[PDB]
From Swiss-Prot, chains A, B:
The gene is PREX1. Interacts preferentially with RAC2. Interacts with RAC1. Interacts with AUTS2. It is found in: Cytoplasm, Cytosol; Cell membrane. This is Phosphatidylinositol 3,4,5-trisphosphate-dependent Rac exchanger 1 protein. Functions as a RAC guanine nucleotide exchange factor (GEF), which activates the Rac proteins by exchanging bound GDP for free GTP. Its activity is synergistically activated by phosphatidylinositol 3,4,5-trisphosphate and the beta gamma subunits of heterotrimeric G protein. May function downstream of heterotrimeric G proteins in neutrophils. Mainly expressed in peripheral blood leukocytes and brain. Expressed at intermediate level in spleen and lymph nodes, and weakly expressed in other tissues. Disulfide bonds: none annotated.
């Protein structure tokens, strides 16, 4: 039932379909850029040598949540503001990112 | 925290990354075949005109769970036995299947 589905979906996401990354703020951003593809947000670029690369963030992967707020429920423009806001506040950035297909 | 992650992972799986299908048993099986690709189980073939096709099962998609038992935790051989066993018992087959990339 619903309870088993909750447990299964956690196991599936956390272990197979995605991983949790943490990136500290750098000079002007978190060392990466995002773009929209289909209705999903994906990493557009990662700055070579940055803490984003160090953290394991790879170009072309979907970002499923930023600080445990799901991305698919929001317009792309709100997701960019969330990222910019997080940066202006110099907080650690927590991401759930897709693993490889 | 963990509780938000549980809620988010459910929303993500149920709404974005997968769908739940139900297939009734037919003559000799459920109208489809499976194979292993990477470490994942995928649909190898769907019988044209079958209840599997009717149900919306598509060739090449991953099957993430069969009757709410996760596939990735098991060897492929156990997954085949689970399917065969389900069929011999003539039970409805419930699948969580990947949506399109």
């Amino acid at each position: 039932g619903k309870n088993k589905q909750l447990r299964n979906d956690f196991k599936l996401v956390e272990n197979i379909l995605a991983k949790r990354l943490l990136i500290l703020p750098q000079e002007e951003d978190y060392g990466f850029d995002i773009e929209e593809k289909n209705k999903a947000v994906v990493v557009k670029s990662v700055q070579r040598g940055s803490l984003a690369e160090v953290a394991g963030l790879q170009v072309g992967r979907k970002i499923y949540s930023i600080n445990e707020d799901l991305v698919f429920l929001r317009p792309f423009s709100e997701v960019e503001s969330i990222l910019n806001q997080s940066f202006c506040s110099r907080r650690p950035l927590r991401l759930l990112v897709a693993t490889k297909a």
